[PDB]
């Protein structure tokens, strides 16, 4: 029947990846030289891939035993599964990118034109997207099937240390943590590497060991960007389930010495299962979206192509979900009490809002960052007033650039909660992040294309024309993408804060009104302090990474797989450090000061991290595109040399660590710190010191 059919969807996603893999490999490369440059970058990634995975492993071990001891073994098992699922995606995506690039450039010559070359480049990228979708959903299907149904977890426990939680809630929290861990290293570690290289490269003006930087371009927006969305994706689904699950013990009435589950088992179990099926449809829609664009007759405009896949995947998801939402939950009862203002159909509306939020947030990120529209143009043209001015105007731009996307978030959240309550916020995150496969594909297109262009550069002009066109679009979709990935990061984290608070329900809270158990009071000094602490930590976090990039860059600068191994090792050492902050802060503050304080910290972290991620992303991209702006020739009389170009160079170099390392790291911070807190609040709620 219809059940398992849906549950094999991640498999189909995976097979499609597995197919796209096949169809890419059979494409050729021209000449010994196209191959020779290619081998440099492909080997570079694995070397880099080796040390980190190995580093990850050591960390992954320590965390797993701990979850099993302090929570339950399922939770510990689930965690490794999530880590493996995300891990796997990265291993696959990196391998693909560094081989697909060449066959684009050659496409730009073998097939001899740009439309059949876009079809190549895009096919590679989709492997990363479908694997991200396929793995993430496959894992959750496994955990659901094995631990949820068979072991009866879907059928409120307190464990051998007296730590209490709803088993499955706790279980998926581990799974979420796993994805988080692989994302953090990929971002806070790989992010340091990529920009250390870019800096280093931009610090030796004469064939330099740029190859490091070239793998970086892949490392960052394929693996890093990809892992971010997966986590937010998983973050959105997990958060929907956690809030749902705890609603069961929360909503009980005491009726004459009986306990009456005012939200009954049937209702809870569906609201739990619902986001998974939603996500399957999302994954399904992207497959239809992906294939259509793939099979289509080629175009001259690859931007239009890429865009067809998103919209197709998104229209599709909006539609089936309404049926999905309507028929499912159709006769459920108590949805009123659950927070469903318009009954059965309510959460579909939330998903739509998230979807539309996502698209808008993308436009805003682009708007403030792309010359073609006003903000970046002015920055660019302000270069004529000096280096001071370029820097000042770029800071001013980004600080302002924060308001429209955040306002977009504000209105979306406001409307989200009207439709489906706190649950609606989490479902919004999921809708936002539905079609994630296609979303990640368009992100991944950028590096696949960029090296291809580079690969043309290292070895015609007619060929370079196609090459240059592909890249222009890559860089845009990458900028839209970050902006979208940040939007989703904020929404996930907000869901995860909600998750943190639901997860605090105690046996000893049972009875009392929702308004008395779902509460973090800001008038409480601990919560205010918490918020300030988390905010300071987020700025510190951001600060450390800037200095980290230059440290590592410099480590490279003093002098091709060895130079990569050297800085990669140094890169890892300096990943640990942020990670203590990221991982232990809930633990440290929790065991010191308790659940209220940590609630503060999470809020500070999210608020400050949301603002700073956006600021750095847009101003950093602006500075780059401002550099681009003058280089295409637009200030008239100024071009590729001259004091304004220098000032723009200086601005881009300030910008380069900020947009591609700091901001994207902050995405992970505001999430993982929440996920961790969701898990550890099991313990430090009761056992805290003061």
Dist. CA 129–CA 444, nearest whole Å: 8
CA 649-372-468 angle, to 5 degrees, is: 65
Q: Between 449 and 602, whose beta carbon lies closer to Mg ion? A: 449
Report the site for Mg ion in 438-457 (rule: CB under 5 A): 450
582 binds its own copies, rule: CB under 8 A = no
List, in sequence order, every beta strand (DSSP E) within 231-279. Answer: 252-255, 258-261
Encoded tokens for 644: 């304004």
615 binds its own copies, rule: CB under 8 A = yes
117 neighbors 433 (Cβ within 8 angstroms): no
588 binds its own copies, rule: CB under 8 A = no
How many Cβ atoms sit within 10 Å of the Cβ of residue 332?
A: 17
392 binds its own copies, rule: CB under 8 A = yes
Q: Between 256 and 513, whose beta carbon lies closer to its own copies? A: 513
CB of 372 to Mg ion, least distance (A): 16
Q: How many CA atoms lie within 13 A of 112 on its CB side?
A: 0
Dist. CA 411–CA 407, nearest whole Å: 6
**Which residues does 644 contact at the CB level (< 8 Å), separation at least 6?**
383, 384, 390, 630, 635, 638
Dist. CA 579–CA 254, nearest whole Å: 45
* Candidate residues 120, 176, 603, 666; the one interacting with its own copies per rule CB under 8 A: 603
* Candidate residues 361, 501, 613, 669; the one interacting with its own copies per rule CB under 8 A: 501
Among its own copies, Mg ion, none, what does residue 611 contact (CB within 5–8 Å per kind)?
its own copies
CB of 30 to its own copies, least distance (A): 37
Scanning 13-21, 140-148, 392-400, 635-643 for contacts with its own copies by CB under 8 A, the matching segment is: 392-400
Annotate each residue in 509-538 with x if it binds its own copies (CB under 8 A) or - if it does not, as one string. Answer: ------x--xxxxxx-xxxxx-xxx-xxxx
> Kind and range of the H or E element at 303?
helix 302-327
234 neighbors 179 (Cβ within 8 angstroms): yes
Largest pairwise CA distance in the chain = 86
414 binds its own copies, rule: CB under 8 A = yes
Among Mg ion, its own copies, none, what does residue 494 contact (CB within 5–8 Å per kind)?
its own copies
Annotate each residue in 350-369 with x if it binds its own copies (CB under 8 A) or - if it does not, as one string. Answer: --------------------
* Candidate residues 111, 550, 561, 634; the one interacting with its own copies per rule CB under 8 A: 550
Among its own copies, Mg ion, none, what does residue 449 contact (CB within 5–8 Å per kind)?
none
Q: Between 237 and 498, whose beta carbon lies closer to its own copies? A: 498
Q: Between 125 and 609, whose beta carbon lies closer to its own copies? A: 609
386 binds its own copies, rule: CB under 8 A = yes
Sign, Cα dihedral of 75, 77, 79, 85:
negative
Dist. CA 340–CA 417, nearest whole Å: 9
Report the site for its own copies in 422-451 (rule: CB under 8 A): 422, 425
389 neighbors 382 (Cβ within 8 angstroms): yes
Output the residue with the shortest Cβ distance to Mg ion: 450
CB of 87 to its own copies, least distance (A): 30
Among Mg ion, its own copies, none, what does residue 308 contact (CB within 5–8 Å per kind)?
none
Report the Cα–Cα distance between both ends of the chain, in Å, rounded.
55
403 binds its own copies, rule: CB under 8 A = yes
Separation in Å, CA 668 to CA 13, 266, 588, 664: 25, 35, 19, 7
Among Mg ion, its own copies, none, what does residue 98 contact (CB within 5–8 Å per kind)?
none
Q: DSSP of 529-560, one letter per residue?
A: HHHHHHHHHHHHHHHHHHHHHHHHHHHHHT--
413 binds its own copies, rule: CB under 8 A = yes
Among its own copies, Mg ion, none, what does residue 518 contact (CB within 5–8 Å per kind)?
its own copies
Q: DSSP of 472-501, one letter per residue?
A: HHHHHHHHHHHHHHHHHHHHHHHHHHHHHH
CB of 530 to its own copies, least distance (A): 8
Dist. CA 567–CA 554, nearest whole Å: 9
Q: Residues in contact with its own copies, total (CB under 8 A)?
A: 74
CB of 28 to its own copies, least distance (A): 41
Among Mg ion, its own copies, none, what does residue 450 contact (CB within 5–8 Å per kind)?
Mg ion
Residue entry with tokens 């973050």 = 235
395 binds its own copies, rule: CB under 8 A = yes
18 binds its own copies, rule: CB under 8 A = no
* Candidate residues 216, 454, 599, 644; the one interacting with its own copies per rule CB under 8 A: 599
552 binds its own copies, rule: CB under 8 A = no
Which residues make up the interface to Mg ion (CB under 5 A)?
A: 450
């Amino acid at each position: 029947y219809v059940a398992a059919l849906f549950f094999l969807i991640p498999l189909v996603a995976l097979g499609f990846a597995a197919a796209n893999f096949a169809a890419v490999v059979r494409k050729p490369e021209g000449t010994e030289r196209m191959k020779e440059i290619s081998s440099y970058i492909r080997s570079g990634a694995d070397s880099f891939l080796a040390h980190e995975t190995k580093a990850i492993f050591k960390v992954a071990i320590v965390i797993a035993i701990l979850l099993m001891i302090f929570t339950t073994w399922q939770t510990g098992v689930a965690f490794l599964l999530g880590a493996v699922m995300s891990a796997s995606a990265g291993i696959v995506g990196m391998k693909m990118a560094t081989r697909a690039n060449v066959r684009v450039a050659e496409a730009a010559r073998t097939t001899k034109k740009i439309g059949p070359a876009l079809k190549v480049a895009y096919q590679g990228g989709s492997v990363m997207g479908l694997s991200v979708g396929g793995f993430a959903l496959l894992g959750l299907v496994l955990v659901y099937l094995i631990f949820g149904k068979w072991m009866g977890q879907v059928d409120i426990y307190t464990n051998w240390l007296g730590i209490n939680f709803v088993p499955f809630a706790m279980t998926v929290s581990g799974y979420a943590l796993g994805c988080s861990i692989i994302a953090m290293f990929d971002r806070v570690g790989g992010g340091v590497y990529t920009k250390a290289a870019d800096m280093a490269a931009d610090l030796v003006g004469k064939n330099p060991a740029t190859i490091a930087d070239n793998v970086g371009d892949n490392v960052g927006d394929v693996a890093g960007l990809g892992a971010d969305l997966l986590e937010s994706f998983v973050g959105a689904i997990v958060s929907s389930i956690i809030l749902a699950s705890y609603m069961f013990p929360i909503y009980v009435q005491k009726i004459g010495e009986n306990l009456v589950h005012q939200v009954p088992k049937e209702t809870i179990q569906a609201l739990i299962s619902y986001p998974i099926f939603f996500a399957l449809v999302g994954l399904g829609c992207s497959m239809l979206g992906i294939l259509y664009v793939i099979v289509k007759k080629p175009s001259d405009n690859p931007q239009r192509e890429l865009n067809i896949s998103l919209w197709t995947s998104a229209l599709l998801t909006v539609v089936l979900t309404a049926f999905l939402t309507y028929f499912y939950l159709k006769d459920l009862q108590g949805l009123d009490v659950l927070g469903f203002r318009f009954g059965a159909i309510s959460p579909w509306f939330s998903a739509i809002i998230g979807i539309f939020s996502g698209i808008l947030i993308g436009f805003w990120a682009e708007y403030y960052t792309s010359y073609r529209y006003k903000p970046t143009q002015f920055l660019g043209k302000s270069s004529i007033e000096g280096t001071g001015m370029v820097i000042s105007n770029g800071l001013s731009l980004g600080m302002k650039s924060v308001f429209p996307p955040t306002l977009t978030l504000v209105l979306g959240i406001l409307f989200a909660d009207y439709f489906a309550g706190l649950y609606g916020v989490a479902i919004a995150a999921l809708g936002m992040l539905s079609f994630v496969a296609t979303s990640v594909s368009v992100d991944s297109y950028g590096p696949i294309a960029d090296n291809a262009g580079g690969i043309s550069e290292m070895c015609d002009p007619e060929v370079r024309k196609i090459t240059d066109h592909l890249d222009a679009v890559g860089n845009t979709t990458a900028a839209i993408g970050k902006g979208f990935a940040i939007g989703s990061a904020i929404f996930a984290a907000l869901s995860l804060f909600a998750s943190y608070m639901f997860s605090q329900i105690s046996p000893s809270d049972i009875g009392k009104p929702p308004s008395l158990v779902l509460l973090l009071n800001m008038l409480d000094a601990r919560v205010i302090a918490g918020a300030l602490l988390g905010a300071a930590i987020t700025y510190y976090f951001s600060g450390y990474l800037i200095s980290a990039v230059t440290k590592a860059a410099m480590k490279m600068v003093d002098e091709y797989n060895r130079c990569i191994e050297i800085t990669s090792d140094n890169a890892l050492k300096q990943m640990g450090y942020p990670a203590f902050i990221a991982i232990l802060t809930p633990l440290v503050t929790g065991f010191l000061l308790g659940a209220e304080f940590v609630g503060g910290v999470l809020i500070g972290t999210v608020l400050s991290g949301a603002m700073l991620a956006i600021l750095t992303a847009n101003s950093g991209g602006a500075w780059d595109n401002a550099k681009k702006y003058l280089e295409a020739g637009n200030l008239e009389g100024y071009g590729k040399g001259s004091e304004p170009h220098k000032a723009l160079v200086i601005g881009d170099t300030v910008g380069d660590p900020l947009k591609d390392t700091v901001g994207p790291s902050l995405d992970i911070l505001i999430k993982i710190m929440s996920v961790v807190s969701v898990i550890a609040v099991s313990i430090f709620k009761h056992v805290h010191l003061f």
